[PDB]
Paper text:
Pendrin also exports iodide (I−) in the thyroid gland.
The structures of ssPendrin in the presence of I−, HCO3− or Cl− were determined by cryo-electron microscopy (cryo-EM) to an overall resolution of 2.8 Å, 2.7 Å, and 2.5 Å, respectively. The densities at the S1 and S2 sites are at ~5σ level in both the Cl−- and HCO3−-bound ssPendrin structures, and the densities are at ~13 σ in the I−-bound structure. The overall position and coordination of the two anions are almost identical in all three structures, with subtle adjustments of coordinating atoms. To functionally corroborate our structural observation of two anion binding sites, we performed 125I− saturation binding by using the scintillation proximity assay (SPA). Nonlinear regression fitting of the data was performed to obtain the EC50, the Hill coefficient, and molar ratios of I−-to-ssPendrin binding, revealing that one molecule of ssPendrin-WT can simultaneously bind two I− with an EC50 of ~10 mM, and a Hill coefficient of ~2. Saturation binding studies using 125I− support that pendrin under equilibrium conditions can bind two anions (e.g., I−) simultaneously. Thus, the structures of ssPendrin are captured in the inward-facing conformation.
Author numbering:
A (entry chain D), B (entry chain C): 17 to 39, 64 to 164, 176 to 585, 654 to 732
Amino acid sequence: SCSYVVSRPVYSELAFQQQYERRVLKTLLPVLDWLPKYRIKEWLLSDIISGVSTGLVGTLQGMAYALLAAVPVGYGLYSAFFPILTYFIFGTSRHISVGPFPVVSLMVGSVVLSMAPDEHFIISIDFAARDAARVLIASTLTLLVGIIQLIFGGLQIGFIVRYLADPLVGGFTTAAAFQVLVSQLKIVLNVSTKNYNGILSIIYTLIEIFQNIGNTNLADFIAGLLTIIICMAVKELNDRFKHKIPVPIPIEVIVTIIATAISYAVNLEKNYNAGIVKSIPRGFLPPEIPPISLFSEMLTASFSIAVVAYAIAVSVGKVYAIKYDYTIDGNQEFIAFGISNIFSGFFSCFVATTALSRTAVQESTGGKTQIAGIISAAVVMIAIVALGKLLEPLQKSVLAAVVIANLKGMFMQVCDVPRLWRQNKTDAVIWVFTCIASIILGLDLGLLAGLMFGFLTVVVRVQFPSWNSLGSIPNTDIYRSTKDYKNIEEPEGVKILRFSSPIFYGNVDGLKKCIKSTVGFDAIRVYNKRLKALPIHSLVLDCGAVSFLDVVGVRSLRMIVKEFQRIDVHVYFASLQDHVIEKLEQCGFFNDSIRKDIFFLTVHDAILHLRSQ
Amino acid sequence: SCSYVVSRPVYSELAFQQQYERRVLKTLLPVLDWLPKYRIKEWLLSDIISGVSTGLVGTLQGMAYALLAAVPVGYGLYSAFFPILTYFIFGTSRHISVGPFPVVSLMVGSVVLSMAPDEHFIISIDFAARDAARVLIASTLTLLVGIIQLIFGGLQIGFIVRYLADPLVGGFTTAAAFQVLVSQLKIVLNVSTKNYNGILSIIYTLIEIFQNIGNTNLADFIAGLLTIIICMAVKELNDRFKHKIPVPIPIEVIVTIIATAISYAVNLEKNYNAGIVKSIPRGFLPPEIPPISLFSEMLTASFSIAVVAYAIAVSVGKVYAIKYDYTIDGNQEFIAFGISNIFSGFFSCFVATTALSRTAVQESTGGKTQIAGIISAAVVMIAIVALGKLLEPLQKSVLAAVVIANLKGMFMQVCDVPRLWRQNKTDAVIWVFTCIASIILGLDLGLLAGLMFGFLTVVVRVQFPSWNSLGSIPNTDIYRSTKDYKNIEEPEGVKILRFSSPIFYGNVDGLKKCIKSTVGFDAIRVYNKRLKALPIHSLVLDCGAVSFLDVVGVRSLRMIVKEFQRIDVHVYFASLQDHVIEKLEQCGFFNDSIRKDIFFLTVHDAILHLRSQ
Ligand SMILES: CCCCCCCCCCC(CCCCCCCCCC)(CO[C@@H]1O[C@H](CO)[C@@H](O[C@H]2O[C@H](CO)[C@@H](O)[C@H](O)[C@H]2O)[C@H](O)[C@H]1O)CO[C@@H]1O[C@H](CO)[C@@H](O[C@H]2O[C@H](CO)[C@@H](O)[C@H](O)[C@H]2O)[C@H](O)[C@H]1O
Ligand SMILES: CCCCCCCCCCC(CCCCCCCCCC)(CO[C@@H]1O[C@H](CO)[C@@H](O[C@H]2O[C@H](CO)[C@@H](O)[C@H](O)[C@H]2O)[C@H](O)[C@H]1O)CO[C@@H]1O[C@H](CO)[C@@H](O[C@H]2O[C@H](CO)[C@@H](O)[C@H](O)[C@H]2O)[C@H](O)[C@H]1O
Ligand SMILES: CC(C)CCC[C@@H](C)[C@H]1CC[C@H]2[C@@H]3CC=C4C[C@@H](O)CC[C@]4(C)[C@H]3CC[C@]12C
Ligand SMILES: CC(C)CCC[C@@H](C)[C@H]1CC[C@H]2[C@@H]3CC=C4C[C@@H](O)CC[C@]4(C)[C@H]3CC[C@]12C
Ligand SMILES: CC(C)CCC[C@@H](C)[C@H]1CC[C@H]2[C@@H]3CC=C4C[C@@H](O)CC[C@]4(C)[C@H]3CC[C@]12C
Ligand SMILES: CC(C)CCC[C@@H](C)[C@H]1CC[C@H]2[C@@H]3CC=C4C[C@@H](O)CC[C@]4(C)[C@H]3CC[C@]12C
Ligand SMILES: CC(C)CCC[C@@H](C)[C@H]1CC[C@H]2[C@@H]3CC=C4C[C@@H](O)CC[C@]4(C)[C@H]3CC[C@]12C
Ligand SMILES: CC(C)CCC[C@@H](C)[C@H]1CC[C@H]2[C@@H]3CC=C4C[C@@H](O)CC[C@]4(C)[C@H]3CC[C@]12C
Ligand SMILES: CC(C)CCC[C@@H](C)[C@H]1CC[C@H]2[C@@H]3CC=C4C[C@@H](O)CC[C@]4(C)[C@H]3CC[C@]12C
Ligand SMILES: CC(C)CCC[C@@H](C)[C@H]1CC[C@H]2[C@@H]3CC=C4C[C@@H](O)CC[C@]4(C)[C@H]3CC[C@]12C
Ligand SMILES: [I-]
Ligand SMILES: [I-]
Ligand SMILES: [I-]
Ligand SMILES: [I-]
């Protein structure tokens, strides 16, 4: 059919260049962006129902996630109230529900516990002073996270969540699910376990839990087990029986209400000594300035918490924006969430982000603009000021059981590891390394280690590329690996090397080794042997995949050219890009008899030029 | 002249594949490697003179570098004696002199001081107990460094010194020169400065030195100043007046001998209260087992010290092996230096490597096999057992002044910085970052920060590549950037994108943005708009520079292909390598109507195929 017919001069870089010559209302996102653009006629009612539903869900979610953080139940209500109010202004996303997201809450609680242990703080037991210190530490960490997020918004470096690769995100998610399960399993059993801060901490906690399982509160354990079973069964029924009832079943809220009513009717606090919350303040606490002197002990934790929370927020926002066909500004997501975390930290709250389950609840029940968020915040507020007393008899085991039941989706990511291994071993290695690191480390330290391991994998992949010795398909200009096709004909007296990577320090050492192996000799050795006494005449370097080039790369290429020219062997570079040749010429490569006449467009001009001599 | 004439079928990947089918005496390096091959007839005498000269230099260097480490003078003699003996066996290199190399000594001393401060150890002043503790800490660190080096030799991962890029090596060298200068300036002034451990430590030390400059010992300062001046003057004369006297002038040894004799004659210890060494033990101390319990506090320091010492050793070994036309095994350099550091740590020595000045002295005075090293070790031994008393009146200011005088070569790299900036800004950024980090951090922490910053620079360079929209030179098959050559003709209804980087998570986000900008529209947006209602017909991706590919890359490519096919826009991949296509097919790319018929050999088969329709 169609044919590849081309007739043109043999163009080196010099000849080709001679013939073809080269050469104010967003950083503070207004509510006025959509409030005048609102649809009160029909959007308002949908926003009302969506906000009521997601507020009912988020009040419970904040109460439960206040257990992940080492703060008393009641400050989760503030963490579910204030950030939504202060995100309604600066938020690009219009479908996400702002709240604790128990992974971020667990990291905050780890930081708070490490900075306020039971034995280190209390020598009496002073529960009130300990709780005050824990709340202050959580507020300080939230303020630092907000400061970091706002700074990253000013720097406009919103691509950092790119560095959170999907394999390491999955591994970190599985490890965080394990950590959350261990903490909430400590909570449901109502066992007293001394806090372990450091390496292997989750294993120490599990060991102590298995040792103290004899002190398990029976009523709390049964309540947690039944809550887990009921929530899981109803979730499975909803997933299976999904054709009807498009709205998800709010099983967690119903179970919590039933548990609270039963505990109030039976008085589990004193008859069975169940671990009820026992303390939910009524009213709004006045703002306080967090002690910034602790910022030095929270930097590595605040950075990772900010990164993780922002990544979750933008992930959910993008998932719903592609569905609803709009865009979200990542830098403005920085700005909004940093302002939110600063505002919440001034008001005794832990770090805030979005939760996938709460966002799904908000969207599925008539998801519209952030007015639904305002309605949810109002519901949380009326829970704070009116329903605080009604939730006193609720056991903490029920909340921890709800969290554990929701942990199943995060736990099921271990099934992707064999698939990753079969597809790309590097990604499976990243997954496993991130999971293991986040297990035996802090979650913040695990995330940092995963990021560094991803960088290491990228560097290693660009450092040990696929290099080949090429030859031409007969009667064509297609140069393929000689040992791969069995019909490749080797040219007479010339070796062609394809080094499929940008050449840098690691790659300059690798490329020297590859050239020495391909040509079959070392230029230094043969030159020295010839000097002491006193098969290849040309080497073509297929540099099509050489992306960038550093000073070490230019120096190595210059040394290779000189060393091979010393033994009357010519080195020709082919398929180099314009920018790489510009980097070569600005690094002083074209000095001492180089003159750019040894640079050809592809690896067929070089071979044709050689055949002309 | 020569012409580029090719007549061949238009080959897609499918058609091309259908028509062209694919498919025990070294780990313990013996002295018997060269001892039977020795040249006693004429090599022995040259070895004798070379060993005598380099031993005279190395005794002084060991005593001087024992001040960089926080150990008494006399243990530097052991550090210059034992490692040479135990490297004569396992060493591949035959020209290097094994010893302290004051940068490694300074890192060891920083570790030792941070673990045995004056105030933390002594509450009386117990100089003897403090010195014993410092020696034990130095021996423990040396043993840990040797263990790490031996493990790295077992793993055969000798390419890690590749990761020590020349810019970061230069920045670390300049910062280490500054640190050594500050410490030896504290020593020469004989000022009592409390040790600062942590961040900004060198600036605190400089501040305290400038505050205590009123307590400077005048005699020690004058001795150090004249030692520095004489060393600089003689070195400059030797560099200039270099045609005669090929052997370098051992000015440091002569200066030390003269200073020792003058101090003995005048008794500066009592008359002028000069800071003489005052204590050099006579004889060999028995070996002791270091306390391994300190290994937990030395891991980050020992890793960096081992890496730096091995890098210096292999750098010097390669510099002299290329000159003398032989090869050195990097893994065996691990093995030899790990055994050396273990042996020396058992015998109260700090970490050992090679020094460029001492190696130059050994080589220039008749450099031959490591028998010269044995002679140097014998000279150090006879200095230990006989000349220990003769060096008692020598001031420490003379030794510190010798080190400061030798620091000039390390200091001269701020001159290399500006041309690095003018050539490759990334390498200059790496240089400056490594220098500043190693200044305000530990030297070990600075090295780790520089290595990880180099990894970050590689990741960023492969993450933000040079991408272009290509068009064809008329009547040829050369596709160049349309906005760069001004004679490029845009083809009808097709856009060609060259993304000059391997496609991974950072690059998948970048590539989505680049495709959307190049084609001028978003596939999701136009598809959604067309669904709501109810200029380019093909996109060619020049993937010549796509080196590797991950699961995220394959997912992004499938997503792009499907999104563009949904709007009747065909996506063709060109110039993909065989291994990248293998990765695509093993990652499930060729499912759901892909069939590999949209993959062409170069970006001219795709265009010719399009013109056929
Ligand atoms: C954007 C890019 C990323 C940015 C990342 C930023 C990280 C910042 C780390 C900051 C840092 C190192 C600085 C140098 C780091 C060099 C790294 C080189 C890396 C080379 C590749 C500061 O180090 C010093 O720490 C002192 C406290 O020790 C602190 O306080 C002193 O002065 C105060 C008055 O100022 C005074 O009030 C106070 O009394 C003094 O003590 C000092 O101010 C501070 O300088 C280490 O501190 C961090 O915080 C904790 C400290 O304990 C520690 O927490 C862990 O605890 C758990 C166990 O308990 C553990 O299990 C958890 O994991 C974790 O909760 C962190 O782990 C650590 O990291
Ligand atoms: C191949 C690639 C590189 C590998 C690098 C390997 C680094 C290993 C670091 C090990 C490490 C963290 C472990 C987790 C790290 C996670 C990193 C995640 C990074 C993610 C990107 C261990 O952490 C704990 O430290 C305890 C001591 O604090 C130690 O001792 C405890 O138990 C003992 C009984 O076991 C008991 O006897 C003892 O009493 C207990 O206290 C514990 O055993 C140990 O687990 C930190 O320790 C290292 O050593 C020092 C400690 O102080 C510290 O020294 C600094 O001091 C200067 C100021 O004074 C500072 O200015 C200098 O800089 C530096 O001299 C280092 O900085 C630190 O690093
Ligand atoms: C929807 C429901 C499951 C929410 C949780 C309700 C809680 C408060 C209820 C449900 C079932 C109850 C348990 C049922 C049976 C027993 C056995 C009895 O000898 C002690 C009380 C104990 C252990 C009860 C404790 C309280 C309990 C766990
Ligand atoms: C709290 C403690 C017990 C958590 C321990 C989690 C560890 C042991 C788990 C978490 C994820 C797991 C990995 C997930 C998937 C695979 C692939 C399959 O071939 C089994 C091994 C392997 C590689 C698993 C090994 C064990 C693993 C790393
Ligand atoms: C403590 C735990 C996490 C230890 C490790 C157990 C987990 C990770 C292991 C054990 C059982 C494994 C599963 C067994 C069988 C299959 C079928 C295969 O077609 C896909 C992977 C999948 C689904 C495996 C995924 C990894 C797996 C879930
Ligand atoms: C990809 C790269 C950057 C990951 C680097 C991870 C390193 C720094 C981490 C991972 C696991 C860590 C180890 C985990 C456990 C212990 C035991 C403890 O008693 C001393 C510290 C020590 C020995 C840690 C040292 C640091 C360590 C080796
Ligand atoms: C050639 C080199 C090696 C000689 C070094 C010997 C040293 C110890 C000698 C040489 C010159 C000497 C100085 C000469 C002059 C004075 C001034 C006097 O009021 C106090 C002693 C003092 C400050 C001497 C101290 C010791 C000194 C510094
Ligand atoms: C102990 C203290 C004084 C050490 C201080 C070291 C710092 C301040 C020095 C060391 C090397 C220096 C750099 C060396 C070279 C250049 C290039 C020129 O354009 C001046 C700026 C710049 C980039 C310098 C900036 C300052 C610098 C980074
Ligand atoms: C900018 C270009 C033209 C400079 C050309 C000469 C270069 C090699 C020289 C001239 C003056 C030098 C600077 C002079 C003073 C200092 C301060 C100190 O911290 C050392 C580095 C630094 C910053 C030097 C770096 C190197 C330097 C900039
Ligand atoms: C490329 C990567 C590895 C570089 C990482 C560098 C980071 C971890 C280092 C570089 C300089 C460091 C800072 C230097 C000085 C101080 C002041 C001290 O009171 C608290 C810690 C703090 C604030 C350090 C935190 C960690 C830090 C920001
Ligand atoms: I969730
Ligand atoms: I949940
Ligand atoms: I030296
Ligand atoms: I020296």
